[PDB]
Design a protein around this nucleic acid. Structure first.
Ligand SMILES: [Mg+2]
Ligand SMILES: [Mg+2]
Ligand SMILES: [Mg+2]
Ligand SMILES: [Mg+2]
Ligand SMILES: [Mg+2]
Ligand SMILES: [Mg+2]
Ligand SMILES: [Mg+2]
Ligand SMILES: [Mg+2]
Ligand SMILES: [Mg+2]
Ligand SMILES: [Mg+2]
Ligand SMILES: [Mg+2]
Ligand SMILES: [Mg+2]
Ligand SMILES: [Mg+2]
Ligand SMILES: [Mg+2]
Ligand SMILES: [Mg+2]
Ligand SMILES: [Mg+2]
Ligand SMILES: [Mg+2]
Ligand SMILES: [Mg+2]
Ligand SMILES: [Mg+2]
Ligand SMILES: [Mg+2]
Ligand SMILES: [Mg+2]
Ligand SMILES: [Mg+2]
Ligand SMILES: [Mg+2]
Ligand SMILES: [Mg+2]
Ligand SMILES: [Mg+2]
Ligand SMILES: [Mg+2]
Ligand SMILES: [Mg+2]
Ligand SMILES: [Mg+2]
Ligand SMILES: [Mg+2]
Ligand SMILES: [Mg+2]
Ligand SMILES: [Mg+2]
Ligand SMILES: [Mg+2]
Ligand SMILES: [Mg+2]
Ligand SMILES: [Mg+2]
Ligand SMILES: [Mg+2]
Ligand SMILES: [Mg+2]
Ligand SMILES: [Mg+2]
Ligand SMILES: [Mg+2]
Ligand SMILES: [Mg+2]
Ligand SMILES: [Mg+2]
Ligand SMILES: [Mg+2]
Ligand SMILES: [Mg+2]
Ligand SMILES: [Mg+2]
Ligand SMILES: [Mg+2]
Ligand SMILES: [Mg+2]
Ligand SMILES: [Mg+2]
Ligand SMILES: [Mg+2]
Ligand SMILES: [Mg+2]
Ligand SMILES: [Mg+2]
Ligand SMILES: [Mg+2]
Ligand SMILES: [Mg+2]
Ligand SMILES: [Mg+2]
Ligand SMILES: [Mg+2]
Ligand SMILES: [Mg+2]
Ligand SMILES: [Mg+2]
Ligand SMILES: [Mg+2]
Ligand SMILES: [Mg+2]
Ligand SMILES: [Mg+2]
Ligand SMILES: [Mg+2]
Ligand SMILES: [Mg+2]
Ligand SMILES: [Mg+2]
Ligand SMILES: [Mg+2]
Ligand SMILES: [Mg+2]
Ligand SMILES: [Mg+2]
Ligand SMILES: [Mg+2]
Ligand SMILES: [Mg+2]
Ligand SMILES: [Mg+2]
Ligand SMILES: [Mg+2]
Ligand SMILES: [Mg+2]
Ligand SMILES: [Mg+2]
Ligand SMILES: [Mg+2]
Ligand SMILES: [Mg+2]
Ligand SMILES: [Mg+2]
Ligand SMILES: [Mg+2]
Ligand SMILES: [Mg+2]
Ligand SMILES: [Mg+2]
Ligand SMILES: [Mg+2]
Ligand SMILES: [Mg+2]
Ligand SMILES: [Mg+2]
Ligand SMILES: [Mg+2]
Ligand SMILES: [Mg+2]
Ligand SMILES: [Mg+2]
Ligand SMILES: [Mg+2]
Ligand SMILES: [Mg+2]
Ligand SMILES: [Mg+2]
Ligand SMILES: [Mg+2]
Ligand SMILES: [Mg+2]
Ligand SMILES: [Mg+2]
Ligand SMILES: [Mg+2]
Ligand SMILES: [Mg+2]
Ligand SMILES: [Mg+2]
Ligand SMILES: [Mg+2]
Ligand SMILES: [Mg+2]
Ligand SMILES: [Mg+2]
Ligand SMILES: [Mg+2]
Ligand SMILES: [Mg+2]
Ligand SMILES: [Mg+2]
Ligand SMILES: [Mg+2]
Ligand SMILES: [Mg+2]
Ligand SMILES: [Mg+2]
Ligand SMILES: [Mg+2]
Ligand SMILES: [Mg+2]
Ligand SMILES: [Mg+2]
Ligand SMILES: [Mg+2]
Ligand SMILES: [Mg+2]
Ligand SMILES: [Mg+2]
Ligand SMILES: [Mg+2]
Ligand SMILES: [Mg+2]
Ligand SMILES: [Mg+2]
Ligand SMILES: [Mg+2]
Ligand SMILES: [Mg+2]
Ligand SMILES: [Mg+2]
Ligand SMILES: [Mg+2]
Ligand SMILES: [Mg+2]
Ligand SMILES: [Mg+2]
Lengths: 272, 49
RNA sequence: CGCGGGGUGGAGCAGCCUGGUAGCUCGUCGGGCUCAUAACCCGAAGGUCGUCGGUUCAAAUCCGGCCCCCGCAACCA
RNA sequence: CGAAUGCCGGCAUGAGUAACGAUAAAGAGGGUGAGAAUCCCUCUCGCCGUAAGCCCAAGGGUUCCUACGCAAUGGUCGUCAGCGUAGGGUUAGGCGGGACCUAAGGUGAAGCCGAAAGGCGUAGCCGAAGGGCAGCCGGUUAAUAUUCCGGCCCUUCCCGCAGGUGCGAUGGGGGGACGCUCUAGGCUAGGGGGACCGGAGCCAUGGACGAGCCCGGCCAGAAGCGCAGGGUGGGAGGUAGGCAAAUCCGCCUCCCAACAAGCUCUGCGUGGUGGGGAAGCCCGUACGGGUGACAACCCCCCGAAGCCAGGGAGCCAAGAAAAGCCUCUAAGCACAACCUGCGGGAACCCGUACCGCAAACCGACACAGGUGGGCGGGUGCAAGAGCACUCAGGCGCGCGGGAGAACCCUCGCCAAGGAACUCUGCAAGUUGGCCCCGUAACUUCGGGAGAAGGGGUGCUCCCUGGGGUGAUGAGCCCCGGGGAGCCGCAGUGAACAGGCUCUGGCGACUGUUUACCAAAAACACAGCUCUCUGCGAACUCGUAAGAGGAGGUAUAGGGAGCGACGCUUGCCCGGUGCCGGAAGGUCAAGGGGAGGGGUGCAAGCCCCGAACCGAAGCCCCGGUGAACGGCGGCCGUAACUAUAACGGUCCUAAGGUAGCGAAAUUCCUUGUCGGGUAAGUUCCGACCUGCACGAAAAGCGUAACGACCGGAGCGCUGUCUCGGCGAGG
RNA sequence: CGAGCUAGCCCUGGCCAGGGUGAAGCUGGGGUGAGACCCAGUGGAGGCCCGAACCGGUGGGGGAUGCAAACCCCUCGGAUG
RNA sequence: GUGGUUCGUGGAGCCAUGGGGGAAUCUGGGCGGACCACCGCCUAAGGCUAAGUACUCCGGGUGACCGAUAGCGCACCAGUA
RNA sequence: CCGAGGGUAGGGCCCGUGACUGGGGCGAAGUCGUAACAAGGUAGCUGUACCGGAAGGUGCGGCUGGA
RNA sequence: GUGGGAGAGGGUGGUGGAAUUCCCGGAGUAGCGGUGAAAUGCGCAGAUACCGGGAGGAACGCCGAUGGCGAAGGCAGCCACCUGGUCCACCCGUGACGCUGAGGCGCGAAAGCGUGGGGAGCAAACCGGAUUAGAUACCCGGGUAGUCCACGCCCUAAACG
């Protein structure tokens, strides 16, 4: 989708909005299973650690289910599909037959009315979740766990997905939304299908405000400020850095790798 | 234009208050000295009810 | 005015700083192949080294004086 | 002690000089008084009136009220006072705050961390104009009143009775509970009109005894209705979720409803009763009292932004918690307990004066400054919180009197010319509201547009079309059309109310900034690209613990630069950076000890110490420019000259492509041609010999946009020729 | 020792008169095999437009032992983000 | 690896120590300035212990100390206005 | 009232002219190279795309007016 | 109409093997590439050649034809669904309903452009090595857009019988 606009105001011409057709006549969220008071704040205890944040629409947290072995075997019916301000993926709310309700990040396909479930059993269909081993090599899938019982963590962004590649001992090779081939443990669930609402990468914010709404204040270039507060700074009419591009704190930012070398997680990785 | 003193009872006891100064090691010393110097008033005289 | 770089056969460049020995590409001349010209092949010629001085036994080469040439600086007021 | 712009104090000079704090404005009579422009009274004049009038809040803290007083305080005076002396004055179960709740955030048992001091820290606690919560109208004081008193109406607790029911928790569920914009129906506040009702009175100056002028025609109000409107399905089986249990909630499944029919719950009327009640006239105030009065207390119209409220519609940026309250069950307990009615008793602490856009708060001051919330009447101008006047109310700003020079400030006007002024039309002028004609290039089809340029605008009479409230009518209130006619110099007659166009530069644009000399072409900006980061992420703060990132997960997050958009973004990896290279060279502690020394009669003890084995880094080998950067010189050549498509040579890591160019880059320079001019170092169009443009410190364009900078025209003008008169301070 | 001025963000309240312009979306019609699309009428979008409150501070003038250690007059930017 | 001592790595002991290795109970162990031999001195890894010494909020005595711009900031209702 | 015309304002078409600039046509014997015609010594022609003093080259697909 | 027939006609989904390139393991050396000849290039840091495994992309050998099909452009492994045209027989039904077609409309190789994906081989531009007088070419080694998919444009051709 992606709503468009006629130019009746510069900016609201290039501006592009999402299409909330996929939003089952829902909107008002569900008390109980979410929401919780969401403590918004751009800095830690005192100081500001991440810069340029703050401001932007008030938000309510939708406490989603990111570990599904909670209900192994208990099937549930997908009730609605709603908007979640805390993420890029739309989310689906679903009523188990157990009578319990919980939200799930909604996969592309999954339609309201559908029945979905989790566990070793589970049929390989959009929405169902199973330990990685039991999933057919090659099938795509989202909401992966990295270590058994620790909760989902990979491919949860709007319309992202990972594809299974092979098996190898108690591990199974994956291919993350980034292109890294990772070795994940067999016992990590991963609900099947891709995340959906993949038009998300196409929304043209539009104006200055639009960014402000999502809570992101203006970002000033180092080049603009002085030597006192950033490498690229001073002296006359602009300047060409004058040294290898660096961050406010001073480490190179055009090429310098960061992953800490001797990490134990190294051996389970294979790509880029 | 607007100036720098905008009186506020709450802020004043809340900041230069007595329990305020007792709470920290530096403030307790603030008291010591003032006590040791004589000062009729150890801390500002906030008021009302 | 000041700083440093440079004048070498006809053209463009080496050759010095560790003085004795001028090298390369083109061009020019004679000869070949072609019907003929170019290409290609075979041979040959050409340099007071910007000039006036001395330095040494000996100066393109070292050192000072001028003749042009090129580039850089001419800021604070 | 004679000097140190010395230190403290006292006194001079400028000097009876500048000032006396908004240009809203004063005059007079009569009081009082030792003493009145300045105090009290009355008459007249002027000023604010979406305040310069009222109600809160914060701050202030006796300033409130009354009596007696001027030495000082008042920018003069002072009999006055916000000043001095004394006395009085602030009354609450319903207002606000606390014996209620939670937000951020603090505090912080458990836990973790830190040389010490201390740092974190799920529970709990604390934390408020957010939630919960029971009072309205009138009367009295010199000063308090939703507080005292009158009327009317409530809320809790406890102790009874009278009945009902498994009662019951800090525990389970429900509710409370939520955005922004736009909105419907019916009400209220508030306001307009009245031939009706109620009133002291009044015929002036030429007319008017008239349905004449003037004044006023309500407020509160339980039950019960009535009118609006908000909430909400009722049964029954099954149950494995709601961290124990539930009959509750949730999930299936059959019934009946789908309607607000019915239950409730608010608001608005109406309501037993209770209260107010003008002008004017009389009085004595420093003000209030009395009469008017048995006051009347009625009919229409406008009408909310307020009420019904958890109303509806739309949208994307997707919009607190906890308690009270309903319900559910657990331990317990069911002679308890809880629910419903009726009684009797109990209901505490603090605030309450007065100032409050200001002479009482923030500014050393009776300071032209600063200060959040609510009410803010009437007429006219299209509307309105704008504008002019003016209600209620409150002012004339605590030095006056004269004078009528220059010169200044603010203001008005001008012959003829009209930008000649000048760095620049700076300043001033022009234009100006509504209604209707009518509008170009260009363009991203929206815009440019209020383009430009025009005409209409008053009042009188006649005819006529819609609504709105009433019934389908009168009136009352909105919107229209058409025809005649009147008067002025002039009809948004005063007040509020764009000068217009052309073309360049910069930046896309709305935004932001050097509080107190710079508002921009600078910052930001959507968007483009590079780069890091697989999640106990990178990164940032911190000694740590920790926290942000993020309750996110590559369509995600951090760093850099570029900066809507269009067409594009060339070549060089030699140097620097970053990246990729299990070969080598070098390499620190350490391993290793050939070998050497010192002492001992000696076993020994103690030193030195070469092979060799030894990381990362450097070297080296590669890559990589939307990484740091760079992107040439000298000669010759064409059948007029001239110039060079062509060539030669030297050096380079490669040797600037496109596009642009006397530029926001051009020194020589007012380059040279062309255009605007009477004339143009500026401007615009070209030319290229680009001192010293050039491709994401982007390049060249670009509709729209601008208190940005340059040029030009029209209009208009005291800017100028070149002044002149008038006004007030 | 200070964030009672000022900068930023967190929690929770408040405020923005009155006019313009008219987006999508609906609805009717047109059209097509079905569309796209074209018309009205409705609709009320917007870092849209005028303009008080309010937030500013552009140009000139006054003020410069000031009324004021940032003021006053005229003029002006934004004003549902 | 450092500190302490006069000792700044010096031929650098001793006395303290964070890091690693790591004993013995009198024929045991430290020290006497690298080390070694001899000759000597002490007996670590547990603790308590007057007096002599410091100071002057306070009381007293004295002054080749001041005499109200001195002397304490204050002679005086001053850590006040 | 209409009204020739004149005045003000802005559009539409056309002709003229303008520094400079684009390509063009023509002009016996100037310079560069050799593209096509023989298999033209890389078969040629082509739509497009990029590049180059120049003819032209190369990429993609097509045609026989070539084998 | 009824009953049948052939077909690389068209759309979507799915799937098979061969080969290539890269990665990993084994084994193995002193050269491999390349051309008219070479050089650039690759390789003792372990290449070329052989084996084993893995990833991915694109095009479908034999069948294959001078064949088929479509209106043209054009269409080729295999499967399925959805779908157009078409030929034969039977002469059953309608009953002149027919031919052409300004405009409109739809389709339209390749290159190209937009947004996103993908990227093995190839290959404009470009960089190197030769050849030449000079080579911005022909040859050789590199190599980017592109070639591939989705959707939206673009309308050209020796779109040729
Ligand atoms: Mg909750
Ligand atoms: Mg911190
Ligand atoms: Mg803190
Ligand atoms: Mg994009
Ligand atoms: Mg920035
Ligand atoms: Mg700066
Ligand atoms: Mg800093
Ligand atoms: Mg720096
Ligand atoms: Mg510069
Ligand atoms: Mg530089
Ligand atoms: Mg710099
Ligand atoms: Mg100077
Ligand atoms: Mg002296
Ligand atoms: Mg003095
Ligand atoms: Mg004087
Ligand atoms: Mg005087
Ligand atoms: Mg005077
Ligand atoms: Mg005054
Ligand atoms: Mg008035
Ligand atoms: Mg007093
Ligand atoms: Mg008083
Ligand atoms: Mg008195
Ligand atoms: Mg006086
Ligand atoms: Mg005064
Ligand atoms: Mg008196
Ligand atoms: Mg008094
Ligand atoms: Mg109590
Ligand atoms: Mg409490
Ligand atoms: Mg909390
Ligand atoms: Mg703490
Ligand atoms: Mg806490
Ligand atoms: Mg609490
Ligand atoms: Mg409260
Ligand atoms: Mg209360
Ligand atoms: Mg009072
Ligand atoms: Mg409960
Ligand atoms: Mg609850
Ligand atoms: Mg008369
Ligand atoms: Mg009533
Ligand atoms: Mg249970
Ligand atoms: Mg009365
Ligand atoms: Mg609602
Ligand atoms: Mg609580
Ligand atoms: Mg019960
Ligand atoms: Mg009170
Ligand atoms: Mg009061
Ligand atoms: Mg107010
Ligand atoms: Mg005054
Ligand atoms: Mg004041
Ligand atoms: Mg204000
Ligand atoms: Mg009003
Ligand atoms: Mg008006
Ligand atoms: Mg006004
Ligand atoms: Mg005049
Ligand atoms: Mg005149
Ligand atoms: Mg004129
Ligand atoms: Mg002039
Ligand atoms: Mg002049
Ligand atoms: Mg000008
Ligand atoms: Mg002006
Ligand atoms: Mg301009
Ligand atoms: Mg402009
Ligand atoms: Mg700008
Ligand atoms: Mg400033
Ligand atoms: Mg501005
Ligand atoms: Mg300024
Ligand atoms: Mg964390
Ligand atoms: Mg978080
Ligand atoms: Mg990023
Ligand atoms: Mg910039
Ligand atoms: Mg380089
Ligand atoms: Mg490099
Ligand atoms: Mg390299
Ligand atoms: Mg490296
Ligand atoms: Mg090494
Ligand atoms: Mg030029
Ligand atoms: Mg000229
Ligand atoms: Mg001229
Ligand atoms: Mg330049
Ligand atoms: Mg530049
Ligand atoms: Mg570049
Ligand atoms: Mg920049
Ligand atoms: Mg650049
Ligand atoms: Mg730029
Ligand atoms: Mg702006
Ligand atoms: Mg004048
Ligand atoms: Mg005067
Ligand atoms: Mg419409
Ligand atoms: Mg609007
Ligand atoms: Mg706006
Ligand atoms: Mg500002
Ligand atoms: Mg405005
Ligand atoms: Mg030491
Ligand atoms: Mg010893
Ligand atoms: Mg000893
Ligand atoms: Mg002791
Ligand atoms: Mg003294
Ligand atoms: Mg004395
Ligand atoms: Mg003193
Ligand atoms: Mg012409
Ligand atoms: Mg011409
Ligand atoms: Mg020739
Ligand atoms: Mg040829
Ligand atoms: Mg050929
Ligand atoms: Mg050819
Ligand atoms: Mg071609
Ligand atoms: Mg080429
Ligand atoms: Mg028949
Ligand atoms: Mg046809
Ligand atoms: Mg096509
Ligand atoms: Mg194509
Ligand atoms: Mg290749
Ligand atoms: Mg090639
Ligand atoms: Mg040749
Ligand atoms: Mg053909």
């Amino acid at each position: 989708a992606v709503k468009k606009f006629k130019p009746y105001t510069p900016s609201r011409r290039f501006m592009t909005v999402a299409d909330f057709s996929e939003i089952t006549k829902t909107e008002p969220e569900k008390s109980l299973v979410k929401p919780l008071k969401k403590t918004g704040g751009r800095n830690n205890q005192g100081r500001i650690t991440v810069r340029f944040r703050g401001g932007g629409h008030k938000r309510l947290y939708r406490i989603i289910d990111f570990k599904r072995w909670d209900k192994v075997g208990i099937p549930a019916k997908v009730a609605a599909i709603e908007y979640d301000p805390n993420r890029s993926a739309r989310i689906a709310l679903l009523h188990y037959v157990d009578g319990e309700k919980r939200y799930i990040i909604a996969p592309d396909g999954l339609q309201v009315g559908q029945q979905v479930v989790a566990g070793p059993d589970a049929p390989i269909q959009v929405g169902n979740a199973l330990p990685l081993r039991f999933i057919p090599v090659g099938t795509v899938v989202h909401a992966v766990e990295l270590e058994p019982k620790k909760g989902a963590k990979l491919a949860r962004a709007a319309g992202t997905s990972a594809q299974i590649q092979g098996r190898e001992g108690d591990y199974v090779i994956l291919r993350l939304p980034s292109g890294e081939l990772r070795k994940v443990h067999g016992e990590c669930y991963a609900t099947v299908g891709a995340v959906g609402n993949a038009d998300h990468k196409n929304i043209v914010l539009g104006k200055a405000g639009r960014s402000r709404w999502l809570g992101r204040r203006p970002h000033v270039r180092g080049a603009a400020m002085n030597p006192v507060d950033h490498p690229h700074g001073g002296g006359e009419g602009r300047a060409p850095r004058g040294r290898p591009p660096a961050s406010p704190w001073g480490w190179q930012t055009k090429g310098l790798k960061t992953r800490k070398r001797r990490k134990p997680s190294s051996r389970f990785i294979i790509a880029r | 234009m607007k100036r720098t003193w905008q009186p506020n009872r709450r802020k004043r006891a809340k900041t230069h208050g007595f329990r305020a100064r007792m709470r920290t090691p530096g403030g307790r010393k603030v008291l010591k000295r003032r006590r040791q110097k004589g000062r009729w008033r150890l801390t500002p005289a906030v008021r009302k009810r």
